[PDB]
Design an enzyme around this catalytic site. Sequence first.
Site, PDB file in Angstrom:
ATOM      1  N   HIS A  83       0.771  -1.228   0.000  1.00 43.64           N
ATOM      2  CA  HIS A  83       0.000   0.000   0.000  1.00 43.64           C
ATOM      3  C   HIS A  83       0.812   1.294   0.000  1.00 43.64           C
ATOM      4  CE1 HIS A  83      -3.800  -2.128   1.270  1.00 43.64           C
ATOM      5  NE2 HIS A  83      -2.913  -2.967   1.776  1.00 43.64           N
ATOM      6  N   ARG A 102      -5.876  12.237   6.291  1.00 42.34           N
ATOM      7  CA  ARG A 102      -4.846  12.461   7.281  1.00 42.34           C
ATOM      8  C   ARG A 102      -3.894  13.602   6.820  1.00 42.34           C
ATOM      9  NH1 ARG A 102      -4.092   8.502  11.541  1.00 42.34           N
ATOM     10  NH2 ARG A 102      -2.320   9.899  11.971  1.00 42.34           N
ATOM     11  N   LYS A 114       0.397  14.680   0.956  1.00 45.59           N
ATOM     12  CA  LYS A 114      -0.995  14.987   0.552  1.00 45.59           C
ATOM     13  C   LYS A 114      -1.176  16.467   0.212  1.00 45.59           C
ATOM     14  CE  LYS A 114      -2.884  11.050   3.263  1.00 45.59           C
ATOM     15  NZ  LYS A 114      -3.683  10.235   2.287  1.00 45.59           N
ATOM     16  N   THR A 139      -8.795   6.428  -1.441  1.00 48.47           N
ATOM     17  CA  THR A 139     -10.164   5.904  -1.439  1.00 48.47           C
ATOM     18  C   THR A 139     -11.190   6.996  -1.106  1.00 48.47           C
ATOM     19  OG1 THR A 139      -9.896   5.199   0.846  1.00 48.47           O
ATOM     20  CG2 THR A 139      -9.590   3.570  -0.871  1.00 48.47           C
ATOM     21  N   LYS A 191     -15.099   7.992  -2.777  1.00 49.71           N
ATOM     22  CA  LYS A 191     -16.286   8.351  -1.996  1.00 49.71           C
ATOM     23  C   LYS A 191     -16.892   9.635  -2.519  1.00 49.71           C
ATOM     24  CE  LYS A 191     -13.923   6.454   2.044  1.00 49.71           C
ATOM     25  NZ  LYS A 191     -13.233   6.835   3.260  1.00 49.71           N
TER      26      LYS A 191
HETATM   27  O1  KS3 Z   1      -4.735   0.920   0.013  1.00 49.47           O
HETATM   28  C1  KS3 Z   1      -5.441   1.692   0.991  1.00 49.47           C
HETATM   29  C2  KS3 Z   1      -4.683   2.980   1.312  1.00 49.47           C
HETATM   30  O2  KS3 Z   1      -3.473   2.682   2.011  1.00 49.47           O
HETATM   31  C3  KS3 Z   1      -2.770   3.871   2.441  1.00 49.47           C
HETATM   32  C4  KS3 Z   1      -1.639   3.444   3.284  1.00 49.47           C
HETATM   33  N1  KS3 Z   1      -1.614   3.428   4.620  1.00 49.47           N
HETATM   34  C5  KS3 Z   1      -0.392   2.910   4.978  1.00 49.47           C
HETATM   35  C6  KS3 Z   1       0.096   2.681   6.344  1.00 49.47           C
HETATM   36  C7  KS3 Z   1      -0.813   2.589   7.391  1.00 49.47           C
HETATM   37  C8  KS3 Z   1      -0.406   2.356   8.689  1.00 49.47           C
HETATM   38  C9  KS3 Z   1       0.947   2.222   8.961  1.00 49.47           C
HETATM   39  C10 KS3 Z   1       1.355   2.006  10.392  1.00 49.47           C
HETATM   40  C11 KS3 Z   1       2.750   1.429  10.496  1.00 49.47           C
HETATM   41  C12 KS3 Z   1       3.807   1.828   9.501  1.00 49.47           C
HETATM   42  C13 KS3 Z   1       3.403   2.198   8.080  1.00 49.47           C
HETATM   43  C14 KS3 Z   1       1.913   2.329   7.860  1.00 49.47           C
HETATM   44  C15 KS3 Z   1       1.471   2.532   6.570  1.00 49.47           C
HETATM   45  N2  KS3 Z   1       0.333   2.632   3.890  1.00 49.47           N
HETATM   46  N3  KS3 Z   1      -0.457   2.985   2.798  1.00 49.47           N
HETATM   47  C16 KS3 Z   1      -2.272   4.654   1.222  1.00 49.47           C
HETATM   48  O3  KS3 Z   1      -1.567   5.848   1.575  1.00 49.47           O
HETATM   49  C17 KS3 Z   1      -3.480   5.004   0.317  1.00 49.47           C
HETATM   50  O4  KS3 Z   1      -3.059   5.559  -0.938  1.00 49.47           O
HETATM   51  C18 KS3 Z   1      -4.326   3.777   0.043  1.00 49.47           C
HETATM   52  O5  KS3 Z   1      -5.514   4.187  -0.662  1.00 49.47           O
HETATM   53  C1  PLP Z   2     -11.839   7.075   3.172  1.00 55.38           C
HETATM   54  C2  PLP Z   2     -11.240   7.590   4.447  1.00 55.38           C
HETATM   55  C3  PLP Z   2      -9.797   7.874   4.500  1.00 55.38           C
HETATM   56  C4  PLP Z   2      -8.941   7.726   3.260  1.00 55.38           C
HETATM   57  O1  PLP Z   2      -8.989   9.013   2.624  1.00 55.38           O
HETATM   58  P1  PLP Z   2      -7.832   9.317   1.502  1.00 55.38           P
HETATM   59  O2  PLP Z   2      -8.290  10.655   1.026  1.00 55.38           O
HETATM   60  O3  PLP Z   2      -7.908   8.249   0.462  1.00 55.38           O
HETATM   61  O4  PLP Z   2      -6.574   9.322   2.320  1.00 55.38           O
HETATM   62  C5  PLP Z   2      -9.269   8.353   5.679  1.00 55.38           C
HETATM   63  N1  PLP Z   2     -10.037   8.545   6.795  1.00 55.38           N
HETATM   64  C6  PLP Z   2     -11.355   8.301   6.845  1.00 55.38           C
HETATM   65  C7  PLP Z   2     -12.171   8.517   8.085  1.00 55.38           C
HETATM   66  C8  PLP Z   2     -12.025   7.785   5.667  1.00 55.38           C
HETATM   67  O5  PLP Z   2     -13.373   7.543   5.711  1.00 55.38           O
END
Ligand code: KS3
Ligand code: PLP
EC number: 2.4.1.1
Length: 810
Positions: free
Chosen positions: A351, A543, A548, A650, A654
Amino acid sequence: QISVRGLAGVENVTELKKNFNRHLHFTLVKDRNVATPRDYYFALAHTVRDHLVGRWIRTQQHYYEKDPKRIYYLSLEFYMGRTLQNTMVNLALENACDEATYQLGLDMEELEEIEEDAGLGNGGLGRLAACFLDSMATLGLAAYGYGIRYEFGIFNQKICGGWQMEEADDWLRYGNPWEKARPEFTLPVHFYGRVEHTSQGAKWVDTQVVLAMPYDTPVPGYRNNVVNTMRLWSAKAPNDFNLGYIQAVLDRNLAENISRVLYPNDNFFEGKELRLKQEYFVVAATLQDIIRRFKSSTNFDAFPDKVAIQLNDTHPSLAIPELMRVLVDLERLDWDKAWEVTVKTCAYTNHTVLPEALERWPVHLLETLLPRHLQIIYEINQRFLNRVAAAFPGDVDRLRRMSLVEEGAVKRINMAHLCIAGSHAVNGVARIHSEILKKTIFKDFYELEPHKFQNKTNGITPRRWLVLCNPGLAEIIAERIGEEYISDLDQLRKLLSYVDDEAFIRDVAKVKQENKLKFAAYLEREYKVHINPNSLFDVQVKRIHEYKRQLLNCLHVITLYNRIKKEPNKFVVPRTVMIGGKAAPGYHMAKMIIKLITAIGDVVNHDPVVGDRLRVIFLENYRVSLAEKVIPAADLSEQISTAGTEASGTGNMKFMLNGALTIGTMDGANVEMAEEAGEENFFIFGMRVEDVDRLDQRGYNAQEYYDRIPELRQIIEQLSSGFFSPKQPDLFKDIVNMLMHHDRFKVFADYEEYVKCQERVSALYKNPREWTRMVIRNIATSGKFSSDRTIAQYAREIWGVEPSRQRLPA
Ligand SMILES: OC[C@H]1O[C@@H](c2nc(-c3ccc4ccccc4c3)n[nH]2)[C@H](O)[C@@H](O)[C@@H]1O
Ligand SMILES: *Cc1c(COP(=O)(O)O)cnc(C)c1O
Ligand SMILES: OC[C@H]1O[C@@H](c2nc(-c3ccc4ccccc4c3)n[nH]2)[C@H](O)[C@@H](O)[C@@H]1O
């Protein structure tokens, strides 16, 4: 009231009223004279939950008898949000419950607002897991979500003097009616200890034991009577633990801390021991459960035919060496046979490509905590590198690049490399991201094993993200094309034949207007804030991260303000700019960005010359329940990450489903969204990935942009000089310094194109009819972004199972 909410039959309404009163008396031990709205919420939750029980028991019985291949989705995060409305939607009980509660003198929408979000995730990754569970149940898959039951989920965000403060999310304070504790299925998990080698294999001894107690939550599919399980593990000390006497009992908290709190860093890796314990805890408990269920169907040859394990990023990667441990040390399979089984069972989803997000664990932590696993990882690495050597003879740098073990000041294990080696499939989460994986960070692996690499573009569930949060839109759609689209979102393409229909155009616009009024009212009521509902609602919620580029949004906002101050008496399309999201508690720059946004609002929102032509609002405590409110109200969706940084997104999807237009870069799934809708129906701007690479090759110099763009220079001078912080003139120096000298995300490089694109947005918004027609073209082409489509592709192309839309008997 509205069709898609189901029937309110007299028999059903009567039975709901009866059961509501029964729970209020017998379950809650209250009478109507002292009951509060919270008691009423709980009585309704218990009444609805009763309707899940038969279906849950019958579903799990059915899997026991049919013995289908089982899918185990392992994640450290499940961002579930509220459950009551979702349950009513999926069981077709919403109108009946609305009628029943109305007859009892209660407002059901008021009761729904009492429920706490289950906030067991940070953002997109956690919420994807939640959408996936909903889709797996809707598609009839024998699927189980496994995770950790955190006592404290993502923190509640308060804003105090414009600064983020964190408060613990004590989500369990009043009880969780949607879980069932299963103490009878508690399992041991081992830590520390040492390895001793006997005549008859390795043995892991002298370990400390922590118990894993499961709590089960039902996951109902959409109107198909399937109810699958999410099993979340909670940490408990054994009763002889530490067993002067009082202190030994108090020290049980050492063990129980494993499930206490969610790590709140999104896209940032921190190598802490407690996090590693959490990762092993979920994996070790889950795998025992998997094996138990498999044996209750000697011959592990059939294991991959009966089990699929999907790793949600590397966070549960220890499943690979744990499965090897169990097969080799306990079941006494030979290594090669165990490895074959493991590879065919496991699949890995990546991811992120941001280097600081990749898990690389110090060897010394694994050596102490998980000595047998470290031995297994070394052995995996040696056998894997022997394959690389045979395929690419003499290529010694490739050997160093592909190793699971990273050499350096501190030796580390690269968990992504471990996952690729031990999985039969590796996927990214949008086409451009999956391509990037093959071209850059996993190029060497793709060259060795091209067949492993796949794409599975993300999606969102149209139950929560249309029917639940935007019933008005769901209804006007159902009026034209029926209800089947809720479980087959591609049917929204039929709406293209209504793009010139004057009635539909008016109704789409009306639904948006009603959503905006409702949200504007929510604002005043619960945050004493006052907005113009005829303004364009310009929304960036996600976030807070440098990649971003909330900062790029801030620069546009200040540009608009400055342009107004320069020509006050010129017309401009009124905007309400809303930015929301949480910053990780230790991420200083993200905290400064929040402060800048509130500081801009303090100036802009109180300038008499601006009037109500421009408002800037920071939306506090963004979370799933708030998303369900703001997304249906939005006109413009800001998806403006630097090209190559957002793996998918994602939130983008939405907004598309809910009638907002998108301004964004060609990043993540934005690329596929523009392809589906047509580029003419999307506001695309900025560098593509190739442009970013070119800039990096010759060197990004922010000074050039400052020197050539006078509007940009003015903003930086305002920031530096204390215009937005009169009492603390140098407050934003860290931000200016980053922008000018150390900006990894090239904010200035996209500024001119972004501002110009925003002018095209404003021009289209002045023509309501053409704005709405473009909206209809977006909604109509959103079908690809259903998580039902995503899950069907995982099922067919990775797990080897067929989805089914067939109903189980009620
Ligand atoms: O695939 C679902 C989403 O995963 C997010 C994502 N979240 C994390 C994530 C989330 C939690 C983490 C906690 C520990 C260390 C690294 C971590 C990395 N990596 N990628 C991406 O930024 C987004 O584009 C993507 O739509
Ligand atoms: C969908 C959703 C996200 C992911 O949003 P991105 O714009 O794709 O980072 C984060 N937080 C909440 C509460 C969501 O519902
Ligand atoms: O077993 C978990 C919880 O069990 C509650 C309990 N919960 C249920 C129950 C009963 C039915 C359910 C149907 C779907 C939603 C989850 C469900 C939970 N029966 N008993 C207890 O009141 C609580 O202290 C305990 O932590």
